[PDB]
């Protein structure tokens, strides 16, 4: 009942084993003769054992700037910050003289150090294809008053599948078991591909390309303070041999996005991904059975507790409450012509039943084009509802 309200909803019917394609945004309603109607939706995709290859700094900050100079023939200057790996140091030569603070004229050694602090970073994760955990929700068409489009899934069974553990038997309380045999149909294989995660965005890039970016980096082994290649974003300036100055090279964030145009993009969300790739599954209804079926028809009348609404697919949803006696009971349902001659509408919510009288039942069915009569219950007080379908 979870798929009701979703536009990208596929209606799949099986002869007596059926093939379904699940994707993010997609929803599949499965139907089989004498088998309960089920709603399948891919809710989560997660790379479960990612190995950080490298972490690149795209935005750098230079703080705690220290400088030391020596007069000519007084030796190379030295700061204790040189030994500190969080700092970037560079030695240079400056013109020294009498009006400068030196007894003798000549080139005097200068040293500038600055603390390299990363503001924003990029992470390159290498994902094993077999380690992509897919979370699928199997929501049966239980009529249950809250079931209709209920995201919480307290109505549907949550099942986890990986490209390799593709065969799973899922137990649906009151319906039996459904056997699912999946296979991933990803746009690009993760063989020689690095999942380049930025912040809220992700891409799939060639390994060598990723390892060749001229940016400061930390290895997967040091996820750390000692950034390798700080020089790729840090530049030292001394153009008149008067003063040495340290300068950052500015945020490479936007620059990166431009280089990542000719790359496969993915929607990211803190460890979990909204992958474009499909998931081709095969499922068997052999061990599935309708809840009740051995039940007797409802002797009493029904009460339409919510306005009949039409879904984006032309199907209609009706919420009815039982006012009679007999529960657990079986709802008599029929969609016939204006003259009550032949039955015309297809029932989506197969075998509609009443569990508790107090609890309403949501029945979904495909009404025929034009004028139809929705008949819910039996005589007397039989709900006669006229319907329009252009």
């Amino acid at each position, epitope marked *: 009942m979870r798929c009701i309200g979703i536009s990208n909803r596929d209606f799949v019917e099986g002869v007596s084993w059926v093939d379904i394609v699940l994707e993010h945004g997609s929803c599949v309603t499965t139907m089989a003769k004498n088998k309960p109607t089920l709603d399948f939706e891919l809710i989560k995709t997660e790379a479960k054992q990612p190995a950080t290859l490298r972490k690149y700094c795209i935005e750098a900050k230079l703080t705690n700037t220290t*400088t*030391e100079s*020596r007069c000519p023939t007084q030796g190379e200057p030295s700061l204790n910050e040189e030994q500190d790996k969080r700092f970037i140091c560079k030695h240079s030569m*400056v013109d020294r003289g009498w009006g*400068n*603070g030196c007894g003798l004229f000549g080139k005097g050694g200068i040293v500038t150090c600055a603390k390299f602090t990363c503001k924003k970073n990029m992470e390159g994760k290498i994902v094993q294809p077999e380690n992509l955990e897919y979370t699928i929700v199997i929501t049966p068409h239980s009529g249950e008053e809250h079931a209709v489009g209920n995201d919480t899934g307290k109505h549907g069974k949550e099942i986890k599948i990986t490209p390799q553990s593709s065969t799973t038997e899922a137990e649906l309380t009151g319906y039996g078991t459904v056997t699912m045999e999946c296979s991933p149909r990803t746009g690009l294989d993760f063989n020689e591909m690095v999942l380049l995660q930025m912040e809220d965005k992700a891409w799939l890039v060639h390994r060598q390309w990723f390892l060749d970016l001229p940016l400061p980096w930390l290895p997967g082994a040091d996820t750390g303070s000692n950034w390798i290649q700080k020089e790729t974003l840090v530049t030292f300036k001394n153009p008149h041999a008067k*003063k040495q*100055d340290v300068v950052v090279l500015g945020s490479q964030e936007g620059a990166m996005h431009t280089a990542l145009t000719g790359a496969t993009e993915i929607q990211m969300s803190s460890g979990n991904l909204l992958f474009t790739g499909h998931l081709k599954c095969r499922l068997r209804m052999d061990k599935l059975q309708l809840k009740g079926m051995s039940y007797s028809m409802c002797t009493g009348k029904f009460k339409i507790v919510k306005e009949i609404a039409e879904t984006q697919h032309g199907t209609i949803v009706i919420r009815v409450q039982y006012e009679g006696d007999g529960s657990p009971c079986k709802i008599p349902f029929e969609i016939t012509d204006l003259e009550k001659r032949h039955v015309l509408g297809r029932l989506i919510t197969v075998n509609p039943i009443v569990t508790e009288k107090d609890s309403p039942v949501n029945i979904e069915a495909e009404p025929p084009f034009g004028d139809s009569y929705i008949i819910v219950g039996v005589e007397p007080g039989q709900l006669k509802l006229n319907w329009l379908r252009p």
Partner: antibody
Amino acid sequence: VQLVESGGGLVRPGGSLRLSCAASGFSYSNHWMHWVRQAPGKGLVWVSRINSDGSTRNYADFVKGRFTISRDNAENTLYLEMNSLTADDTAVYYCVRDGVRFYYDSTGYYPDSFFKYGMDVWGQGTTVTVSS
Amino acid sequence: QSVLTQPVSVSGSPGQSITISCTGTSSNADTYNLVSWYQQRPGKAPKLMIYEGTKRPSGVSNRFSASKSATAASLTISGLQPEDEADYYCCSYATSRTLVFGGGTKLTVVG
């Protein structure tokens, strides 16, 4: 030649304060400037120094990085931004000029190791009381 | 690292010559070559008396002289006067980049 400090007063423990010194009667931009403090009835304690550029800022070991020295050459002003203040920071804070370094390095830029210095001009000092 | 230590007090009579010593721990000849001396009269701001171990600035009385060795620095006040009663502080480099003051000496001109 004068140095006038401002910004001193009562501050709560863990609190912050910004001291400000106004210089006049000399080429401020070419001189190193220092902050020295003195606890009531106690000895002089060197706090910090800054070169002409602001490229070199040095601090005493007790200021683990809690104070930041700065200057505005065009405004002839020296500052001392102080955070995480404790009772051991209660003192008179003096704004001081290194007049003798100017005689050797007229730029006031070069941070040579152990250079010839002399704190020749002192302000009247501003009182900082760190109390709970 | 370098720490400067001075006597707590020195007492002299008017007209006499008194000497205040400034000794260091992790110090060397350069520490004393760079010693500066400051006079602080009660409730007044300090005043530079000596810089560069032995140099006296203009305006500072000729009665003030200083000496330095490779192990200590000393300030000598010759012809002690009542106005010389003050606290005296020595100062030099703690490290290549920082300064350090001595503990101070209270000079009493005996009355």
